[PDB]
Design a protein around this ligand. Structure first.
Ligand SMILES: Nc1ncnc2c1ncn2[C@@H]1O[C@H](COP(=O)(O)O)[C@@H](O)[C@H]1O
Ligand SMILES: Nc1ncnc2c1ncn2[C@@H]1O[C@H](COP(=O)(O)O)[C@@H](O)[C@H]1O
Ligand SMILES: Nc1ncnc2c1ncn2[C@@H]1O[C@H](COP(=O)(O)O)[C@@H](O)[C@H]1O
Ligand SMILES: Nc1ncnc2c1ncn2[C@@H]1O[C@H](COP(=O)(O)O)[C@@H](O)[C@H]1O
Ligand SMILES: [Ca+2]
Ligand SMILES: [Ca+2]
Ligand SMILES: [Ca+2]
Ligand SMILES: [Ca+2]
Ligand SMILES: [Zn+2]
Ligand SMILES: [Zn+2]
Ligand SMILES: [Zn+2]
Ligand SMILES: [Zn+2]
Lengths: 455, 455, 455, 455
């Protein structure tokens, strides 16, 4: 066995057997890709994590879920041994230069798809050029999610502007009037005309029922026109005269959150242990937040909210304990670097925990699992239309919309106050006065109305 | 055999059997904790150290007295492996943030008692909030027991005010007209009106006897009123003018020492290589002290006492030789980080040695072997009542001091020149002018002043 | 048993077996020397790499082409066990100081030929003194080869001045009126009278046919008078103004390129993370090129070309992409250290790539297995003569030049548009109007014309 | 089965056989110490090296001549393990503080001898107190022997002034008129009246004879009067007009050389890269000597001598070469850290070479067996007398000189113009007119003439 075997001097694996197919191979093991493995164990997937650190290989070889290979990720010969042409997907999670090198190298050998994690927003373009076909600015995203949760009140965070008509935004419920209520009694479609595409609750995008009661923690995906969204901003109200978010840590994430807050102009103060060599736009206070007066003197006592974004979890927990114990009114949003700390961050007294490991693994998994659906929608228009009077009663197949307009239907919201139906089967009876959501070419969107009217 | 397994490639124990009850597990092994294990080796309990350092685990594997488990100690899955819920207790000797994390984690799984060693006294509150049943500011204690021994004479050093009630104080008998004299020709009981709880020698509190000779090293434990303690302050005599104390090493222990000396107003000078990343109150003279030209320039020639407080014991020894060579009169107090450097620090000519491990291990070891005896000692007051007129010369168990108000006597004093008895068995005959030293509830002692006068 | 000894505890080879002869040993293993061992695998040369690093020995054992010895290069006993006397030749690729030590130690034992790589051009002399037969300033060569490529246009780069008459020049084609033309169409010889000895294409020296298409990657190797080079210079046209070159990386190679560009007065700018521990002659801008505005604010906007000379390949790949992307018109020469990246650098958008490992291992290759011709080409002349009329139609041997003049024909250039013939065989028939290129001594050169006429 | 233990996982020894006697044990291995074991290999003594570093124990194990033991050198229970009380003697070659700590710890267990290498002259006193019997400032000695050899012509150098009658001093023979002519044909013995005690050559010493030839390499050891040294100094002839010595490397040993050359006021320049953590007394030109400019610009053109005193031999060798080449006249003294580099230093061009390994090992060896000859030698005022008339023609077996005065003759200067006898046996015939160097007391020197003649 390899049982008896591995009690002898250790040697790493260098290459994979020739018949290796449909494996996913990971470059840049960390808590986000470790979570991605664990999470995709419902499928008998094969994960190959590649390390060029001989010492790392040794330790990973005792962990299950995945196979470790040792070798230089940027040498064609190593990649060839990994059977990159035969692989299902490739996850590029290295430094940005190392990723470009990785891409270009594999791209010289095959077209196997690559999802790359980009550490600097502006680098995304470059990783595409190098041949990544999917580029996830994880730290930008993780920042945004901190930014969103941090305000006293919670406003609209824009997600999509589809060709200057239909818009998609999210809305945290916390400061809002809608907190502790049902989706029905909140009166959103009734006051605004907006559609509620869904609800985030635990990285789970749930179809929103009428009876569903939303918490302080609920995040509401919404679609509508710019004007409609405005009507909604009016309803939530305006923020406190003097809110001030205080961001502990100005690493790549803290920087992102800061960059988020600056757009909806929200004042913030930043603490870091270090001048941090990428940012030239944010004025930072230097010190160890862990040290006594550091925080008080930096003026944490004027803050309406705190964002705990240290690369160390023990620290994040500690700062949470401290800020809650000292300033028990302030809203605290904390970053969880590993998923095995998320609970302690709550225990310590955080209001929300952005769980990096989950959020990341979650995005990656979806890009893997829903590859085709994502592709099929690239560059397409999403728009909303009142059902044409002469189509009421009809079934979806009966309207013949795709063959006549090119556009098809992806969601219907019922005429009555009734939950949204996403991905309706073609045998769906189109009700009295429902609104429908349609994906189509943007050119065909411009034209849809004209053809429906023509017939 | 694990003698043959010793010789094959190393693999670390990662968890504990299911049948593992009453074990004592330790987080952050160090001189203090290694000493603890050695000390309570007679009390038949298995000790378990936990490290996330692979190599440390290796080197500790071969060590006797305790076994090693290699795992991230802030992880619930690891903790479960360790069978925390089934442990006797936990020693949390990690960093402060790391302690808070380990704390909140073990609380979400179980209720097992946790003694926490605290790096910064201020953080004491937070770690109780984190879930610690007990919290120990060791450095402040070690910083205290240094300064105590630094003064030429040695004065009152307060341990606790029982809130208006009698108070507990320690007295180093070195520069006192009580040095050399046995208990009685000192006359503390007779001519002051105080009680001698115990005498420390080399880190162990003894039965104070009439014949026991006080030396320089002897440290007394005292109980009495505000005016009773101040009655002995003049009995010591005048502590000579021109009193300045040099402390070498302004780390945490060094800093603690300085701040102690500044409470009972006493001047000192601080020397260190590096600027403290923690302290900002004390002005430090900078330079290596091993080079003698630096100490000289600092005015060490106008000093009455030295405190040697360095991370390295080999240096501490060397500095003690350097001084006893120059100033053969000066009071030198040295700190030993290890226990195996104590005798050499004496041999070099130190007047008292504060053994970091000996002191540390005592404080823990006691909290352990008196766990459900000193835990409800949080908020309790200690008091001394006279012997009742009607209940004179009758048995203690019969007096019914538990089923009257709710009181309990931990020690009793004798009227004649007869030796005191600490924690005595419940069958002894009382006497004439005796004084009872009890512990109780902060509202039961108030009742006793009229309860024993009515019942 | 060779594969079982692999699974036991590691012990390195200390010495070669006594009977070892004719082997090539290498001190200072790196990409260049590793490419060397690959390139000369056609020959059954035995390579032994020596290392004083215990760990480096381990990871090189399981590597093919060469065997590893663990010892101190500069211990006379280590060399003795390495059988240095019996060795074919030695490569010195340590630091200058260690090289010097190595050579002196080696000379202490034997006369075995040493080829030494010289980090510092000025230290060339010192290493020859030390015992080294051949001295290679690889950093300077690589520096020069970047500089040649980096100009907007490409100009003559002198290589040899053989006793003040026949000259040898290099000429990169890229900017010139020859790019895209065949050698024939270029009209060089027609208008110049230069001999085209060669074309470098991909590190490979090719024979110039009249119909080989010169591309932008092509490096002509020319032979001729100073006035003839002067003529070619006139034909290339005037260089364009505002030429300014950005050199990213200012370690040895960048520095070398920079110094090269300084001769033909060519403006440049240097960037580096670090201050140079070696170069006091060069004003340097400071920053990580990788970081965004670093380059912009340094004024890479008005650069005409860019040498990307970092010591890390992924970085240089990243930087080439970045520049090709944001400044597409700007010419880019990039340095590859290690051959597994040359392709990617082209893929990224590099105009030219200079392969340290190729160029290096190539030069070292010729210096090895052309030993008894290389350093016997020391004190030697390269000259050109019209084939003496009488020998037209006679064979080379038939002519008997070597016996008569001591001179060896090395190149025959045929009268008409016909191909140059390099290192022609003795059986070659000499043409009618052919020009000869001969190798001999300066004395032999002088005697030649008389020896031919009078004899 | 030692070749079996070798293939399984490594385990160091942590103690020795319960019956290890007469073993000499070394603390802190380094060149000098590793040489000591080689040098005294002829004597069947067990050498035991002790390191607290693990990897050290690993590598020292596969090395012949000495047994390796892993342990904490300062732990008393480790020392009991080493069986110190039974060892022949102890070499403490740790740092100063560690050395102190060691000494005391062993002094807690036994009365076994200790030779201690000091790093700072001023601390040697502290080490004696600590328990070292013999204390040796190598770095001081080594700096001296470097400065002695650096003078253009070579002057006298004072070893000892014993109370002010007999002076012992050294003389390099390099530039003196005595260079080349045998001890006889220079008449030092004859003209100066000085006792030539020793000639030093290639690190060794034996009895000087008239036929033995003094090369530039030679260093004489002389006993005499202040008038006689003053006579030798005349024979030397004046030092050259303008002379300056450059010292490369202001480390411990470099610094000592500089100090030495201030006694005899000789101008000198110091170069180093780093500031001295120790020396305040010396001005230093800061620069890397290796780099070109550094030396020349620091005015090395006008030097008369150079002392090359770097940590790193390869640097010394390289510098020697560089100097010898630039300055063929200027005399060069170079320091060799390991014996395996000595030969290459001469090869490079060094006029003289000081071998730290030799010089150091000689001293320790002569203190380990002439440990028995340090028992009946030192501290006695070394004095010189002719033979008392009443001892002419009689043996030491008949004279009984030592029990009478208390002095023992360490040198019988032969009757005629005949060679000296050092450490003579007690059966040696004494000749009529003869000089004696006695290392007895000046108790028994001012007593000598009285006692030696009255009986
Ligand atoms: N105690 C602390 N106080 C302030 N900043 C910290 C502390 N610990 C870590 N950091 C910062 O947290 C940031 C983490 O960066 P990133 O992981 O990229 O978001 C770094 O800039 C660290 O300097
Ligand atoms: N020779 C020395 N002179 C002055 N300070 C020192 C020396 N050696 C160590 N230290 C410092 O003494 C401090 C000990 O910290 P603590 O144990 O907390 O008092 C550390 O901060 C060390 O940097
Ligand atoms: N991102 C970067 N930006 C600027 N310079 C760099 C970067 N990375 C490495 N270098 C420098 O490139 C140089 C390469 O050295 P050499 O191999 O001697 O040419 C070194 O001096 C490095 O400090
Ligand atoms: N290239 C160099 N140029 C100048 N000084 C050097 C160089 N290399 C080493 N040194 C110095 O040589 C000294 C050797 O120390 P020691 O062995 O104690 O005499 C050190 O203090 C170094 O700073
Ligand atoms: Ca946790
Ligand atoms: Ca000790
Ligand atoms: Ca590559
Ligand atoms: Ca050598
Ligand atoms: Zn920023
Ligand atoms: Zn302080
Ligand atoms: Zn430069
Ligand atoms: Zn100095």
């Amino acid at each position: 066995a390899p049982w008896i075997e591995r009690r002898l001097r250790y040697h790493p694996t260098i290459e994979l057997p020739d018949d290796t197919r449909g494996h996913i191979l990971i470059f840049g093991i960390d808590p986000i890709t470790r979570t991605l493995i664990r999470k995709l164990e419902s499928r008998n997937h094969l994960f190959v994590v590649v390390t060029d650190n001989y010492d790392q290989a040794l330790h990973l070889e005792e962990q299950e879920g995945f196979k470790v290979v040792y070798g230089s990720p940027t040498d064609a010969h190593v990649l060839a041994g990994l059977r990159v042409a035969a692989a299902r997907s490739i996850i590029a999670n290295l430094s940005d230069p190392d990723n470009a090198n990785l891409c270009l190298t594999v791209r010289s050998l095959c077209q196997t798809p690559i999802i790359a994690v980009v550490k600097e927003p502006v680098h995304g373009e470059l990783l595409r050029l190098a041949g990544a076909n999917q580029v996830v600015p994880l730290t930008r995203i993780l920042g945004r999610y901190l930014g969103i949760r941090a305000t006293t009140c919670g406003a609209l965070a824009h997600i999509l502007d589809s060709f200057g008509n239909l818009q998609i935004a999210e809305l945290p419920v916390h400061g809002t009037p809608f907190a502790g209520k049902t989706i029905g009694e909140s009166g959103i479609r009734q006051r605004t005309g907006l559609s509620i595409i869904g609800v985030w609750e635990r990285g789970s995008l749930t179809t929103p029922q009428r009876e569903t009661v939303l918490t302080e923690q609920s995040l509401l995906v919404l679609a509508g026109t710019k004007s409609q969204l405005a009507a909604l901003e009016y309803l939530i109200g305006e923020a406190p005269e003097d809110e001030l978010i205080f961001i502990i840590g100005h690493g790549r994430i803290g920087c992102a959150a800061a960059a988020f807050l600056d757009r909806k102009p929200v004042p913030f103060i930043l603490i870091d242990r270090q001048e941090s060599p990428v940012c030239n736009d944010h004025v930072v206070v230097y010190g160890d937040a862990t040290v006594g007066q550091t925080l008080r003197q930096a003026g944490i006592d004027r803050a309406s909210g705190i964002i705990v974004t240290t690369n160390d979890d023990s620290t994040n927990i500690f700062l949470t304990l401290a800020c809650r114990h000292l300033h028990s009114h302030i809203r605290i949003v904390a970053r969880a670097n590993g998923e095995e700390n998320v609970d302690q961050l709550y225990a310590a007294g955080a209001d929300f925990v952005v769980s990096n490991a989950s959020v990341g693994a979650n995005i990656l998994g979806n890009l893997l699992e829903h590859k085709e659906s994502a592709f099929l929608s690239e560059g397409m228009a999403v728009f909303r239309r009142p059902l044409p009077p002469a189509m009421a009663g009809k079934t979806i197949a009966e309207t013949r919309l795709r063959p006549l307009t090119g556009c098809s239907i992806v969601a219907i919201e019922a005429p009555d106050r009734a939950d949204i139906l996403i991905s309706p089967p073609p045998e769906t009876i189109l009700a009295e006065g429902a609104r429908l959501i349609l994906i189509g070419t943007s050119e065909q969107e411009k034209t849809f109305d004209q053809t429906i009217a023509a017939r």
